[PDB]
């Protein structure tokens, strides 16, 4: 159950979250702060793509007789130019923004992984599949303190060192 392996489907509370395993209990959880930042950011981006557009009262359809052929050709040319520029700009813009959205989400995952790794530098063995297996045994307050960001090294340092010596 790691991020390199795939994506979880049980949790829907946030885009980003932790899975905790304990003797007392086992379940999923979600990082409200990280997800809230990201949801706000994506909302702002979508609003800017749709809102910055401001339409005015324009008439597109024009009528010209047989004598005014140059005017009809000019109107066709300017309409074709506008639609071609709009198509090219919109398609390249949406492709680039999709790539930014995926890149930003991956960067959020890597930032969360590096944060929890910097907090658990050597107290927990790293599986490499996205799982941090604790050497030291600690209950649910320990894991939610890891979620809280208030985990401390010296409290479980000696037990972790003994568990390294055992393995």
């Amino acid at each position: 159950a790691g991020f390199i392996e795939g994506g979880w489907t049980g949790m829907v509370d946030g885009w980003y979250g932790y899975h905790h395993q304990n003797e007392q209990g086992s379940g999923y959880a979600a990082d409200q702060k990280s997800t809230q930042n990201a949801i706000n950011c994506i909302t702002n981006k979508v609003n800017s793509v749709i809102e910055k557009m401001n339409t005015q009262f324009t008439a597109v359809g024009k009528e010209f007789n047989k004598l005014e052929r140059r005017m009809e050709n000019l109107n066709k040319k300017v309409d074709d130019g506008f639609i071609d520029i709009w198509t090219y700009n919109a398609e390249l813009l949406v492709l680039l923004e999709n790539e930014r959205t995926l890149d930003f989400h991956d960067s959020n995952v890597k930032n969360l992984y590096e944060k929890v790794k910097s907090q658990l530098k050597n107290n927990a063995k790293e599986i490499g599949n996205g799982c941090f297996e604790f050497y030291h045994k600690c209950n649910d307050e320990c894991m939610e303190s890891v979620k809280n960001g208030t985990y401390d090294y010296p409290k479980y340092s000696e037990e972790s060192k003994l568990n390294r010596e055992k393995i």
Partner: antibody
Amino acid sequence: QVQLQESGPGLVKPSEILSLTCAVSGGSFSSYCWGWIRQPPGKGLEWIGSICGSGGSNYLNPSLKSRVTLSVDTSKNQFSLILNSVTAADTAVYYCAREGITIFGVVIPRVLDSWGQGAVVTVSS
Amino acid sequence: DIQMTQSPSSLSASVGDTVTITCRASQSISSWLAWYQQKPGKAPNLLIYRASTLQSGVPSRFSGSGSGTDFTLTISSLQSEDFATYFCQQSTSSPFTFGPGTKLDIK
């Protein structure tokens, strides 16, 4: 629109298991979290705890963490509250509600829309 | 954790008036807020989510805005059904505490 119906004992002695069962009609335990809200008489609302999915995500209040345990069973289609060591301060109107609102595919945390009509319970002699 | 305050505590207004209710928060909650109105003895219902948007099935007379530590809810025309109490809720972290509540009354 989902319909929420809750059943309660209506009376509870001090210091035993207090259990209420909330049933939902027209909805399932899929992609929507479910939570419990209680209000004391004449005081404001507060959040006891929330379950989401089918037993996957469990959230509890820090003050009531040891006291409340949330259990679900989709086959019978109810979610229930289990409370031990009940006190006189627990006299409240229990509300069960659905975390039905969502933005960009996430279920916003703890923003409730449709609740139940309420089941009153008092702790007394 | 994130303490919630409301102002004014009690307000009275007539039918058709404009009333602004300002719930205030101890620490920045960004744009995340829930507004609930509670009829006496009935289930509270959702009014405003994200402090700027309207949930469907709510009349469009209600409007909310604000950012930072200060937020406002503005009602354009206040009818008889809107005289119930109102609540302010934050949704960024546990515990998800609620506002003390603001009561509305005729004159």
